[model samples]
Target chain A: MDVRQVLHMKGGAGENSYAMNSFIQRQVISITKPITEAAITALYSGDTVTTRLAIADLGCSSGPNALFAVTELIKTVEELRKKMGRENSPEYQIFLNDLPGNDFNAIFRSLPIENDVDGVCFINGVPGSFYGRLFPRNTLHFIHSSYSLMWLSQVPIGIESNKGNIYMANTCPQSVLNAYYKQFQEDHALFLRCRAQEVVPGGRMVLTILGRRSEDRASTECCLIWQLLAMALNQMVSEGLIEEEKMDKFNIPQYTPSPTEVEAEILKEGSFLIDHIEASEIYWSSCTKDGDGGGSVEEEGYNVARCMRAVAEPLLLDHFGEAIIEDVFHRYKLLIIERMSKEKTKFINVIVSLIRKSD
Target chain B: MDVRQVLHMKGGAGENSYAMNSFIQRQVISITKPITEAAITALYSGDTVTTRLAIADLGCSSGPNALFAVTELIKTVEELRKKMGRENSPEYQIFLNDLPGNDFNAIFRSLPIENDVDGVCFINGVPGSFYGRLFPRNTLHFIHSSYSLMWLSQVPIGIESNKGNIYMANTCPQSVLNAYYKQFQEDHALFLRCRAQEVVPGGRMVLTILGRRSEDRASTECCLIWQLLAMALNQMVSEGLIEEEKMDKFNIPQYTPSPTEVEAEILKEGSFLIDHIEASEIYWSSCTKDGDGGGSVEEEGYNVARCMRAVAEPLLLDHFGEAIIEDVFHRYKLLIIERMSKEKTKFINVIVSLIRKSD
Candidate 1:
């Protein structure tokens, strides 16, 4: 099966589904809100005014958090329209785009019907990859995407290094890190080129995705999560719960670039002028902090394991049997707790605002 | 059945299909070419620029003519881009819109796959009514419509005075004409209001539809074709082939407005600035006049009758059985021949270009 086919966030409102386990993604949304607001204000600044605004939330996966980006963007734009003292609120055309295998029916069911509302906000689903064009030229005025661009189109075509790990890890050889960086550069460049044709000149795009604060290719913050995941898989392999050879062949398609790398790609494409880039640090325990455990490290580790499983289970289950999920995550929690006791591990989310330049 | 249900141009590539009978529509397209070119030039006139141009063809029915407007407009823009010495050609996002029941399959099948082409021109069908919003606000840069917009959403709500006519004629009562005019004014205003929200501030629209040269609602040139048709149906009534009451109840959902009426609606809407309006005369026999006619009035009348049948036969067949189409049109041709021998009759097509003005 294609990656898009097997890589969806767990569906439905069940306990393990994305709908029930999207607190981390929601945190990402809140952190990126101010950047989205500033972009909207600049896009509709005094010299450029329009009665209708078109916006797209790319990689809007199906879940309770799926509408989070669009809802926040609309609120930001609406508030700006009022502050400018415009007599009428601009009509909104909101598009939610995701891979073809996404559960669009759930997303549609969750949307508030806007048919009878006046000055209505229209919502539609555009199921496709953002690595290519999904909208008409100059039709989109603003675009917002969160927590999605870390995925590469495919694993760097020919990389045999990092034989034992499933993603970037500090223990992996230098060649493995180079392959990941090469794939990210190519994917990000194509992404910029495709969006250059679809976005209107002067339009704005706000993106928040996983990255590293340090310029080093093997930053601990970027590699720790995957290293813990690989530890869990190796534990299962030693116990004969999963085959060791299977673990060696299954590398992830995700890559976390540093701020410098992202800036380099954007400047190389030469279609957008960077307005700002911010690195926000978020801890894995943040997602698990809500429940009552007196903030114990062990409890936080367990919660973090659950959050990872929610996102990675679909891909893992396709490879290993469903019966091993409980054992893998149990061992994963113990490893995370041991690591947390020794040092802090955090994800550095890189947020950027870009303006499309005139031809 | 609703008018939308029964009122489709014939499908397929057969002789009687819309594809084969669209010559007159093609001619209208040619006649309106200068106006479309002028509108596009003014829309992108040097100072106004974007990297991508968004355009729509409203009331774009199926068959060969579906892409006619878009193909011509793209070529015109390409030529303009070269003349202006722009470094990059603007990509196009073209929308084709019509009623829900239209043959969209044929339209989709005929479009070129734009994915591999550079400076890609994306085409998508918007299946809906133009009387309401079909696009996001301020996204479209230019809009074009040909030989449509004369159609009302429905026949006038209450007009029982035209006892023996299917459309406007000398025999129809004054109240009947008033009803038709009222419906046109309402529908046209709504259309302008919807488009005003969709089109950008300086965007331009070019529309060509049936209308009259004189302000008089009952002008001979505008009423002659329908008048002759009523005569043919009355002949059927006399022969008891069709009931007179059925003809009374079956008024066409079409109206031919004079330039004055069209201007009144535009001014009332107060959104668009009139650039130019012209009344172009096209003879009824023009649709039927093939080679070797030798200017014979009777032969010209027969050709005109064939052209009328190509458009109206489906509607007529639905109302009166298919068995009577041949006889009704046969008698209709004789009446048209008698009228042409006495004096020539022609349709006055009103062509107008309007620029959207800032609020």
Candidate 2:
């Protein structure tokens, strides 16, 4: 399954996009305040008589939400500049990037930014993988991402599940999951590499990604949103709305860091300092509030499961026929409502931010 | 009750002497890199110059710990100054302080400072609450206090239950607590006033104090050490070892700010910009390490409760009488534990670092 197609097909941000905007605002502020301060310090240190800041909001799809984050970044920088008493302004630029297929027409039309800030997208289709090489070396002071990384352009190629092509949800087998993890590592290294080159002596990076930790891991309680979504999919299969093939084909292409996991990586990188980690349950809980557990026997709006019938539903339509996919998810929505009703549904969202050390 | 006497009694660094030093070190390091950068920017903007720093750990008592915090402060200031590229070395000052009776003689003797650094002390018979007056008007570049301000000289004179001094557990009578709230307001105002007067423009203050939420509204699973101490005290009283009468007169002369309550007062103060508010459950999981819901009741060494008892029991005895207070607590431990045990066992230690805005 192409992860981008999955996102292209998945419901885009609407009202809930507000939450994403709010969350991203917080994420960027945390990194920007510190980085800007560090930059100003470096400039004053005489090591660099002046500083140039390079910031980018990677996967910055065309939308009001993306623009909102950009405006916020500018606002924070302005506030920080005033406090620092910097004369006039230093060289600062922001790169607004997105996938090759992203709706650039819409994105460019609404950019209410002046030349003081830069907005441009990655023309390449996530260029191999968003895991690495997003930009040039040491060229960025800040990097921000949201909502886009969860998609893998293509599912792990070697998986033995169903006739492949199932990206409705992240329910892939361990084999496929392993491949995804490998990709994640490769790309993360590239991301780190790009940042290493771009960040000045004391730059900062803020990121928001879609991730979930297992229930047993003592993760931020809000991570349960994904779990509950999983529960809803399971119910869809039981109802026979989807087939066994579809269930096996689905897989999530994202990684959520355990607190310790993140800390270890940061420590290993040896260039970033750990600032703060926040775990939130608001997102999961908010989604669950609308309904419950799973889809119906008819496979209504519930596309969470990977069943043979469900798996073939979307694939069959894409390759053989588009008809089966409709009924499969028709049953999905009903099941979701049921699952949501069974318990006081809630989920968790986790955010982690770090600052670069002046090595 | 004379608040002055309370200061005289509680001014000395008890067994918890090391708390303040450790706190200052942590805070200084936490903000050093960035605040220094901020100062550098300020210098460039003419908001400041040279990133020259004069950080003073207020209420500093004579001890290796106080010395340690001062040393760390200087180290951080130096690093910051070096980063700012100053030709002239930044001046460093460490203000060793206590009531007139503080062991300044020893503190003065052990001063191991570099030539550029200066150390001084200001003593009044009363610990002369730095919350009121401590330094020349607007002289300090940075101010830090740890485990100190929580020790309000005297318990705020609040509503006393008609039963007078009985150590009744769980009877916070909102009526009484409301009165206590009023006293907190008074003291906090004085605190703000003094800080406002002392801090130069753009100065910052990092404070860490011990506190708990109201019993009824507390998050159930937090603060193991405080909980253990409370249960231990409760057990001692239940066993008829300590009289309830002495309990009423004994209370931790401290305040715990609920997230909202603390934030509100900070904004209301109108002088400082609330920089950050961090709340953490001090992992006394060390106490609960063996999975003991409650730890050992007594040990060879004086426990936390015992040390606290040492401070507050005297106050109770002073207010009441030795005849009644005698034999209430064990030979070494003071009666305040009996009082402390009955009161709510939970607390929040708010780490608030505010930047002086309207100095």
Candidate 3:
């Protein structure tokens, strides 16, 4: 089966499910609202009070944060409408699109009903990969996606020679980095091509993804999560819980793209106008922010480990089986704590907004 | 099984599916565009482009026409946005709702992806009855229903006393009319109550349903189609093709409310302020329009019969056998032709727009 077939946030409303463990994604949506609003303002610059406004939340994983981006989008429009002294507002057509394996039932069950605003909104789930066409031509107006799009549809082919590393790292040979970059370019281009046909002229799309702030692909800020995960897996290998060669073969199908790399893809696609692109830092532990940080490395490390575990467990489980999941994360937590004690680490989130070109 | 379980347009994209025979419904959508746009303008009159707009199309049976209302709504918003000199538009969240048995797959496959507008519209199918709550509290911005809402959840109980009639008619006994009115009041009030909880304070709902121009429930304009269906069934009964008693007990789950009756439901619900209400006439044979009506009554009758058959086939198939459907409609076409030759007949379409009241 394809990796996309099995990769999903943990299901249901359980403790380990994405719904409970999605505060990180929710924070991403909140931190990026200003950018979101700016794009909306530009997309509807004149006096357009559309009868029906179209929007899509791509890779909208099932969770508490699944609707976070959409909820914020609604607030932005409501504020704009009020400022214009509009009596009632336009109809809303929202699409929650994700891979077929996603838990759409949970997302649908949690759909919100608003009583405060004047206009009505309709939400539907479009279950398909966004890397391909998921909608009819020229029908979409706005697209919002966060904490997704960084995931390549599949791992890059033909990189079996790079040994002892499962993802990009400073110590890994340059070939590994090249493989990941090549995959990101391919996937991102296809994504743009698919969306270019779907989004209307002058329509806007806002995306926030895990990325590298530095020009160098081997930057620790962007590579630490994967490096730590590999360490945990390697330790398991030594402990006889897994085979060493399995670790060598098990690269994650994800890439942290730089702003420049994303811009290159946007320009190459030649269908979207780059609106804004910037890198923002987010601490592994949200509590790590400010001068009032009081949490121990152990606690902070555990929090970060849980967040990654929630995202990576399915991939880990597929390779290592269910019995080793708890033990793997336990060791991963200790490894992360050791690193955090030495120095604070943060991840770079690249926020990009684009407009579908009329031409 | 519940009546909602069995009530839906024919499924699939095949010859007799709703997709292939939904032109009548498409016409209904076009005819109501003016009222729809006006309501949208009033809803967003000042400067109310909500951040997240919620919209629901109740009784949105599946087919090509499934998204007709939504497509027009998107156009209206785009036009208004351009006129307002607004740069960015609101995100739209649309819900396509119908009975549980509606052909949702056909609707899903036909969702539009715009390439002309500046904003995006998201579409989702909501499968449930409009007679009860199907959305979250106070989340919806606008609600639309066309050629539906005339359906009662089921035939009023205890109407078997009237022999040899399947629907309201000029000859329907007073008891039969009273029972139908009672069901309409109950269903319509529940519909309003459900929407009242779902729609926002200043939100608007537009509905177009079969209705009567006169206070008399027996008016031929509102009662002809059902009367003709009964005549066709009675012909079968006389031929010993169907049991006479079955026709006596089998009343259609539909009613044509007068404007006064609709007003009473709105007042009883006490949650919505009526904005506009008018009744328009639609000929069963749209092709019959203009002086160039060269088609014989047989051809015109066949056209009208196909339209009704597309809508009523599944219901008739359930009560009667599948084998009898073609023959029944064949006889129905002959009866309709005979009536058309005698006098021109049309169905009354009552259009109403309402605004939800704030607490």
Candidate 4:
């Protein structure tokens, strides 16, 4: 039940690690660069004194995206300085935070070269769950979170009928849906409330989450992959590879909210006001495709499967064993290729510029 | 020769890691607690503001000793609060500084359980060599560095005549010794000068170095172990295991100065005033001995060899490759037991308290 021990993305720099398989997340951060740029643009466009900008990335799993996101955000600030004819850029104090299990070593090892910016971009890894206070009160100016915040603090206790599904899919009944919503409401509000205390009154937080496009939970872009994962697990159970009861009991501690759901909680918390918000479909492999007819569908299958595996492996690896991981990922690769051929399934992502309300 | 890339002790929590092999370091920190306590005693015995005391462990090699050193220092302050009839102890902001390759992840994983002190004992890892500035000017109150300063930033360039010896031994002629002395002088003075800018006036630093007790470079207590290490490598060459050229060229980047040299360097920098100093011999396996006639002597051989291996493995592993490491450590273990049987060889350690002189 403890998320701190197992909720993080698969850590380290191996082929199976989140660091190597973070293309989808890297693209998400890349696509939302301008939204993030403009948000921080006005942040210091109205402000100066060679700002010691204390920006943070919450749920910064020790993956390449954590570095990718911060590089763009800090470069955004540097570009702003260049445009305004400012001589010195902000002395960047970047706090890269995540749960205790996240491999902060991998994150630090791949830090930007020391002299990348005009001033030092000091990176500090803060180990703790970001659902609570990380930095001191009014200590942070900007917070950029991407491809994080979707995993809830706890799986909704009453999600029993959420059987045959790893996530809160449409297959679940009204009670299961109700349980999931309240859990999201409780966790999301709790997160913002904690951020309210830590973030300065005028502080800006840019959040990008893996969310759903529609109000209906039926057509969730995020949960569909989990459905396939569950299907793969069921196939394993039928083959006597893993126990039926083990597959039945396992539920991913995940929540994919709509942009409607996100805004509702932001206003309800009354601490952060929505400035600019967005939702988009992240393609499976278009940007990844080369100019000359990219490789085969088999390649896409492996890439997509491995990407999802990195996120799910830590949790599932603990649940079952190494044997299941080897077989399931292989089977899921085939499943991804099979599904990718039939319908063009895309991932849903939501980005928002949220300003901490004035005291 | 980038020291930051490979200067640190062996990383991680494995059986062969510095964490497991740090009993020698743990004892050194234990033996010097009173000196460190008295140094910090005067730090806040004369001050307060709900005291956000910023203390750091320099060269804290991501081992158990780093945790041990900080815990004792913080606990020392806490005990002082109790002695003075104070309600609240100071808020401790611990910056654990080391070379970039040090395993900060292991350090954070074994942090003093949250709320071990009266208030928060916040730990942050600052990755950089202590040869340069790690913290802002006037930001630190106390710095505790143990068993770390004996390392030179670079090996002296012109020591070709010091062939077959991994360290500055008594056998080396005037030119070799002179070259090493100059490197240590340049490195030590540069270190103290950089530290002067970072440590505030009235701040205290307690340094514990592995050093020789006398002026003669031949009788260095610290260098003897490296001599044994070199002997083991030489034995490997005779057996046709590792190349003779590799053994001849690999001089360990280490320095073992007497109190006379240390005081000269301190006064030359003209920033920190020497407060208290002492030298002691650390036994290889005394405290580890049981009241019930502590098992076999062979046990001590493996323990001693592994401890040294944890410090030297990264450098040696890269140089001679894995095949040599496996054979060399076995030979070193046998050598340690042989030496232990013949003579009572002990490690020399120096501990001192130096106060930053007020401007």
Candidate 5:
């Protein structure tokens, strides 16, 4: 089976993007910029005096933020080219990569990029893992991926602990971590393979990934997002919105690599050397303000409730669902604001930008 | 009212001390050695024997780590005295302050001092909010507090938001925040007044307080321990282990100050010149470990479950008796451990240390 078949069996993609947009914007934006810019920079610098540029947006989910990154990348490349005295460019080839099950057609039709560029950007279902070679060797000069790569190509298979649920049960043996680690190694090796085969010697590859910091592994501060999301899933299960069997099969395909781990992988597989690594933190709120002045506190409360539902989906759906999601979110948002106002502070998004060194 | 009458409404001083001790030794000891050491050093050189050689620990919860700082401070002062010789030695007075309802008998019985030193060490019961002047200002040299501040003197008086459940709803609204801030300001003012009246011209004060880093205040990772603990309390109420009615009146007494906010508060108060503000993120589990073979994963699981019971007790006792407490803990332990083990990491303490500078 393909990655989507294994994971998206519960149904999402569109709603997931919309619901998690705020979080994506809040948490992942700072990390994504350099990856996009680096890819564009490498692509625009070279040419057969080409009159046009080609771009591909892999896994362009339905949410505005997902597509926005790709659009901005293209715009930046064009702007750079114009500055270099190439105003009238050639046609472009834009590909939107995701699972066959994904709403690629919808994404492509709805995208803000128009036909004035005299180029074609079509949605292509790659159904296979990027861990395997996704594009032809030496055929591309630029590649950018955002908020992906952390997830394994598939939900780690053959979990034996089977605490009667797919979500790691309390008594999970060392095997679970072993299994996940093995999957990470495999996927990373495959990713390295694709990098070697896909890009030109001087081509650049920029990726924004969900990574784990060295300190977090030992401290309680580690896996901030996953743990909370899982708890919310448990809450859903208790409420009976989805089936327990569903949660068991669902897994987040993510790997939190320390800088050392990432650098080691990049060195071992990819052809390019490291250029630079940048880190940033970001924050945003989905809950609109609740006040007499268009107080959407109530409305914001509703969206906030559904937000987690959208993000956690089938697992939360099976475990706990709409029944109590609203109540929980209402309380969560309140606590969030209270804590925020008191501290007079926001979240931190640690972004590490790695540049692809030219040969 | 007597300390026994007000706070002891929960239990005997012995029991509270036991609970607190268990928390400190088990939960706090192993959080991070560097943080604990830094805290002790700040309180010693800066709080004691710098501008002020006299000091008191208000509501000094019974624990090895609690007194650890005092011992270190004494050692530093003693060393300094030896360096300067007896004639040049600084005169020092140390006060161990708790409540009349505290384990005064046990604390006094266990004094570890040997023979006569030139200084006096006394113990006092501060029955009221250390908000009021506990000692004459400009008369003492140092003042220090920990853990107790995060727990308010009494639960905040307010409407029942959780359908009469306390943790059921959390809103640090202007009202809630104002109430907390006013109390903090009041106590801060009293602290200033007494310092001005009791200390000599050049005296120092230090506090190890519960607070958040400005970066974490609004982030999801922030205050998670308390929230998890709150969930435990909510579970107790839902289980009828605690009375829902009592939830209305119970609250944490202390305001978790942010670094920026603390700096501003200190600047506004203008009691002492700003010396240094440092923070340590302590792990509650370190204090909770209380022996147990490095708190094996299983033992830690037991402790996490026990926390649900321990935190819920005040409210739990209202509905259930000591007879039911054991059973409640047993059942809840299972559920809590089930969840706790799933967490990638967990942490609970954030201690902000501030020192007063010598003129």
Candidate 6:
């Protein structure tokens, strides 16, 4: 089956939808804004020129955050154009891209109204995955992806369905882990190569990927909570609400690479020069709070469960049935609370900024 | 309200949906095939060029017809390349454009899979009105719009809310007709000017507008049947099913121009030179039948009612409320039978092929 046929963030503006629950993803864009500004500066560093700027935000699933970083990037360019005293001030063609299932209608309806900005921007939604080429050759000046590349184009092949876990974990042997790692390598390399052809030489790409600080695929920051999620599903299995066999057939198609793993793949692809890379340990549940001062373990558990539902519910709904969702997440929330009382829950992300090579 | 906010063909692929009911539109494309081919040939008639060709179809609202003509045009170019004996066929960038409210999701999901074609085509959805700038300067080589330009950007602003009929009529005088005419003139001129900046010099645009063969806007082919529809609404007002006040405020925001009016606007716009122009009378109800011999006036009335519903239900739903739609159309079908039993109902379309002037 084509993965594109059934993959997208939960769309819409309802309470449970991704549009309302993507604060964690939104925070990543906020964290990486300085890097995005730097990339745009370096984009125009060679000489002074401004009139048209074409850029896109890949995997811009529905909501404010989808265009959040783009709005900032455009503001940066607009201010830069004014500083340079360029007469045209630059027209922009902004492409907001995601898979076919994304609710682009909601995005388009809110547009030109989505934000207020100076000068003219022709906004178009490019509906397709970035795994293959989506733009014409040598067209895009910059590309941004936030908390999206971790999704392997599909679930990694070669892993046993009966492996008893959704993602990479300490219990899974190196063979299963190798499958996930190899999938990320292949998918990320294809992404770089396709962008290599589509992006102009010296075009900038600033991506924030979920990654780990630890060398092990078993890193606590990325893997432990999902291990709890796997445990939640197992408990439902024991209760006979979910068939053990059906449970065995499903795994999240995601791999969180350590920054080294990401850096190695970038070098191996050999199409881009790394400008900056950094890791941030995100207490994701805390993002539900404004600024700081998040609630207690139980409240944080509910917050995390809600955020996870926004991110993973669509894939889960497609694989399992909708019947299992509320129960699975409710049970998962309790498990998170049970674990968090003893320790903290965390997610690690790596931001890597690169320039398209002149090859 | 921005006209873009509210205007669109009925989206989706159900039995009563535009996708299923647009065969009349599909036929216009079929009849104009050679002109579309001529436009593409003239586009490449310049120098022998093969690599990447960028083109767009304006007002490509959702469904099979949205991409139907584009698929044929690509096939035309592909066969042309093979005949020209080019070693490598060029890639294609197809922008299927429409208003923001257009169901691009339907358009996107039925993509690359909708046809089995050779070579590469990168498809993107451009969601916005085409009256303003869409593509960047000199970016497009060819553009095609079919049965779409008839939609005046908005109901001509100055027309009174109390104008008894929906569109132009013999009873409404030239002032009301003038309001509709000036709207078309302004809209078509703005469309040409934007395309002038977007299409490269010597590029081509092939357009099919629903138009009449007569000098006056009072011509028989387009306006007569809508006069029947206007009568249907007035009957509802008399029966007290629809409020008389609300009925007075609603008007269909469309105009079928004579070919001369379209030609006059193009010549005045000055960016394009006409290549070919012709008018075709469309017995739209007959399209629901296979090739010939449609049923009685009773059956044809039902078919026309369904076709009219798919074409105009959104605006009706928005204006008159849902309560009167089924009743209104049932009465409309009866009125259509009453009128068609005496004679036949028809739609008129004019195809004009133009080349971007090398000014």
TM-score of each: 0.56, 0.39, 0.57, 0.90, 0.40, 0.94
lDDT tens digits, residue span B1-359, model 5: 11222333222223433444255433343433344344334444433344225556655644343355555555665665555534344444455544333443234323322212334322222323454444433446556566554444444445343432332123433333345455555555555555555555545455555556644343223344445444554666677754454642354323344445555666676656654456555433523325655443455455555443444454445434566566655655554455556664343344434344445
Cα interface RMSD of each candidate: 6.1, 30.6, 7.7, 2.5, 36.5, 2.3
Question: A154-180, model 4: which lDDT tens digit per residue?
Answer: 767775644555767666545445577
Candidate 5 CAPRI classification by DockQ: incorrect
lDDT of each: 0.71, 0.44, 0.71, 0.72, 0.46, 0.74
Reference-based TM-score, model 4: 0.90
In model 4, the clashing pairs are B170-B218
Judging by TM-score against the true structure, name the best candidate. Answer: 6
Pick out the ten consecutive residues of candidate 4 chain A with the lowest summed lDDT: A110-119
Clash counts per candidate, in order, are 0, 72, 95, 1, 58, 0
Candidate 1 per-residue C-alpha lDDT over B35-57 given as tens digits, one digit per residue, 9 for 90 to 100? 88888888777645577687788
Q: For candidate 5 chain A, which ten residues in a row score worst on lDDT?
A: A115-124
CA-only RMSD, every prediction: 11.2, 24.8, 12.5, 3.3, 30.1, 2.6
Clashing pairs in 1: none
* DockQ leader: 6
Per-residue alpha-carbon lDDT of model 2 for A1-359, expressed as tens digits? Answer: 44443233221233222322233334433434443344334333432324444456666654454555545555555555566646534444445555333433233323322211322211111112344344433445665565444444444456553322232223333344356555544555555555665565555566554444553332333233334334444554566644454643454323333334445455666676655455443222221222354334222223223322322233334432344455544544455446545554433334456666666
Off by over 4 Å in 2: A1-359, B2-52, B97-106, B109-127, B161-172, B212-257, B285-301, B309-347
DockQ score for candidate 6? 0.60
Q: CA lDDT of A135 in candidate 5?
A: 47
Worst 10 residues of 3 chain A by lDDT: A109-118
State the displacement of the C-alpha of residue A156, model 4, in Å, after optimal TM-score superposition: 1.9
Give a tens-digit lDDT track for model 2, residues B244-358.
6356335333433344455666777887876546654442121212233443243212343444444355554654456644443453243323433544333355567777786
